[PDB]
Ligand binder design. Structure first.
Ligand SMILES: *[C@@H]1O[C@H](CO)[C@@H](O)[C@H](O)[C@H]1NC(C)=O
Lengths: 44, 49
């Protein structure tokens, strides 16, 4: 489609940046419960 | 020069949206590719005047 003036722009976060965000949400839940989404992570 | 080879009565090629993307030279029966010349946008990053 590049012949007629159409282009595709890349996203700002890559796929490895989004995978780093979801593994930090997983580790916070497994080690702290719901405390890390309200302040400091408190282990339990 | 392309890695495409087609039937000897065909002159040029088209794709899914009917854009010409290959052609045969009418003297040396060779199959050339066609790609567009380079285009794009120009963006200016300013910290504010
Ligand atoms: C056209 O003439 C050229 C002579 O330079 C020859 O190489 C080519 O094969 C010819 N094409 C034909 C007869 O289709």
């Amino acid at each position: 489609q590049k012949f007629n003036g159409l282009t595709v722009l890349p996203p700002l976060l890559t796929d490895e940046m989004i995978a780093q965000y979801t593994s930090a949400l997983l580790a916070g839940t497994i080690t702290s419960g719901w405390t890390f989404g309200a302040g400091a992570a408190l282990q339990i | 020069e392309s890695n495409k080879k087609f039937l000897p009565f065909q002159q040029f090629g088209r794709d899914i949206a009917d854009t010409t993307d290959a052609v045969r030279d009418p003297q040396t029966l060779e199959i050339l590719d066609i790609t567009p010349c380079s285009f794009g946008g120009v963006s200016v990053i300013t910290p504010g005047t």
